[model samples]
Target: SPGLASLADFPIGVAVAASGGNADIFTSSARQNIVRAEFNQITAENIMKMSYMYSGSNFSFTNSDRLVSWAAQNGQTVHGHTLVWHPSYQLPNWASDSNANFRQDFARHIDTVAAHFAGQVKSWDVVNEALFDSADDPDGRGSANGYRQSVFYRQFGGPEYIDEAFRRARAADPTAELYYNDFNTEENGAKTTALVNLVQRLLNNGVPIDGVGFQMHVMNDYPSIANIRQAMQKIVALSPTLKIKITELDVRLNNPYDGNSSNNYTNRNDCAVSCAGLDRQKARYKEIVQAYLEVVPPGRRGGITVWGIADPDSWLYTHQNLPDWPLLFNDNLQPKPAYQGVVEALSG
Candidate 1:
């Protein structure tokens, strides 16, 4: 069977734990082989995040450089994960700095990081998850529209931080595509509207954002295919040149488990022990790929990047402490039914 990278019209990418150590993608030959065979593009799962790259007034490119070097040796294009994000953990040294220093550090990070990877990385998620999920506040930040009131928002008093970040990225790397990556915009109506408004506003203001990344970290059954298609079309309708990418995609089958409650072991095991849940996962993967192909024209299809290399390697398992089969590869790094679903979608 052909790999998804071979069949897809645009690039097919996967998130990889490329920072050395005993990460399965590096230590296990099975994982390594699958990455090279199945994907032509790679995004560093953690090593490229701001938390991993910058610390105490200095930027470290050791891990990220290793990943980029590895990608080059293996014939894969590198997609920089992010330059700016709102999470506190992702912003380690900002709390104590004065507003002026914070703003300087912010621009310096984007300028230095983007400049370092300039021609090597094809694109970058210059800013990630800057908007609040509409469910949090139906009206959003009121005057700010849908922007999250992160430290950056508080410092600049709105989305000026976003505008500055994109501008710095463009100055650093004129060729690499810059994106505003967010989650839940694919189906949540309010979030989608907010995202479109933001993009339009940026374009009107002459911000150099080249694309939008819909982090499709969704469930197996919810967020119907129709809704996903409509959301992509809305973004596409914004501009003929604006591209879209499924930046971090995974469809989980199990409900999230609260720490005190018993986990959904039965539902989680269905995909591993039976076909019931896996069948739904397979279909969902197909639908997602088909939707991206249908909504975004060939020129505007940036790519579809699966969030992880395999189910066990998924961040959901570690971050949420829940057992779920959410990727196209199984625990043993072999292709699952979901892999076939992607292949079928691309084949069509």
Candidate 2:
């Protein structure tokens, strides 16, 4: 991260630390930073909410239990990320196939994982990025998907699988909130509409779902606020029970690719900027942050979390082509103007 720039003064809420593979490691890291970098920004007016990359899988206890325990001990609220995601992180090999034996294993996985942190976790991402369609109804004619591939839908179960997952989670922790989470929902697209429809369908069938997550990846050039606002409103209008949260929020820039987006965002190899160029990145960051501030409602909307802690460790550089720095902090442990912009946006 670079040294603090224009953003040092503005306030921020969550100082989300990165977590992958396991939840324990990342949660521990965040707990450690609770007083360090976290105190620097999060104040009485703006309480820093805890955020993490991934949790709620079979291996989550081993991976994130340490962090989750730490959070619980410190009176920090835990945001349970993704009980079920399209991609396999905590998924057992049993769930990968369409066999009855595996079905039992899969169900057991959900039951165990959901039960493990039932009361301890405040909320849960029941399912993540399951709707691959960018259009309202991919099954309908005249629709196209930029990323048509849905891992879960294609792998073992169909769309019904999503509802089942939520149902199972609901049963596990009746009190804990359940949410469907995904990115690219901030703007009007087939994806957002589809999610709304899915939520409704689940409700009609008596599935328990509490909220929807606008992943709000907050691309510097690709703004998602309009769609996000519409989706939030749509969810609120459709369901009396469902709330909205900026589940995974971040700012990234790059040409785009299938894997590893972050690259040399600062140099010729990267299309994104580095920690040094905070001055140049102000306009875009300000607007994007303002977009979040204006759109997300406090009562209905949950916390807003930036994806990366430091630019260098960011997944933006790991995936896609070069040149994507889509996060708050820099490669070094420094704040950027964008970080402050988020503070101002949330302040309102």
Candidate 3:
């Protein structure tokens, strides 16, 4: 928790996660004891939005139901993660069949969940990284749908699904905001240009879209500060009403330091496991924050929540199949030096 305190000196609010089965974790008496211990950390005022999608627990993920109740009871706003991610994310069995019975069953899932949390839910990430390349990435995702590779895309087929989700979400909670969330569109280049064009199309197509979220997960800074600013500025230019959110911010510490971090970038700090990486890793986090601050001018940027709460839970480790402690928070929930780096960057 000291690592989190590192953030207190910085000005941004903390956005704790009630990830899918979060409710389940704190439900047990022992877990609740831990939650009670760390309970003060999830302060109502400090807590930002509770953004989440379905956990892979099938019916056992009843934790979500409780999570919603707890969030509302605590005066926290809920940021719904997604209505439709790829069908690969798994859907109810009824969705497998496209018949009349399947149609109602499938549609009802969205209607019921959204309506159930209605007024309490503040915003919804209606669509996810739908454009990720599916072939090489299968899960990495791109716009490559071989005309129909995208399961969700082919389900209702294409952009219409996004449009319908907005409509349905509006019907469920007219007051709640609706947004399209995705990664990689931070820079202003051809890819982002296409994204901008399509965003305009979505707006034109009669969807009650309210905002756009950039899941800023950069590695080696593929997209620079100038590019991201250009992208955000463009979004504002196109529609001043369109709010902007830095939905999932994770600037990976790509320590290409000494130029000997391996030409292949194999020396990605994975070897720097233990506290052995204190210095090299710190420098990497510093550089990464430099890139983040350079691009996102504070006032224009909304909430910035790292994908993982602590480095121990970070996806970076899995990506490398090795130890990858790459977050501003350490395993003990203490703040790393980079937390201060992010703060200074934001405060600038």
- Give the per-residue lDDT digits (tens) of candidate 2, residues 1-348: 322212333222343443342212244454345324442221111111111222433343543566566556644556676666544434445545454565565567567778877767777777767666533334442322222344445444356667777888878878777887776666666666776667777788887877777766655555544555565667667765467666555565543432544532536444333354344345556665565445544455555555545556455545544545555656544566776665555444
- The TM-score between candidate 1 and the true structure equals 0.91
Candidate 3 lDDT, tens digit per residue, 1-348?
433223422213223444433323333343333333322222121122222323332323254556556655543445666666654434544455354454454466567667766766667777766554333365544454222235545556565766776788889888877777777677566556666776788778877888787776665444566677777667766665776665666655453433545433344454344443544445544554454445444454444445555665565644644345566666665656656665555444
Overall local distance difference test of candidate 2: 0.55
Sort all candidates by lDDT, best to worst: 1, 2, 3
Q: Pick the candidate with the highest lDDT.
A: 1
How far does residue 189 in candidate 2 sit from its true spot (Å)? Answer: 1.6
> Tens-digit lDDT track for model 1 on 254-340?
655334244354445556756666888889999999999988988988899999888878887544565678898887667888998
TM-score-better candidate, 1 vs 2: 1
Which residues of candidate 1, in runs, are more than 4 Å off?
19-24, 95-99, 134-144, 255-268, 318-321
Clashes of each: 0, 39, 10
As a TM-score, model 3 comes out at 0.72
- How do the predictions measure up, each by TM-score? 0.91, 0.72, 0.72
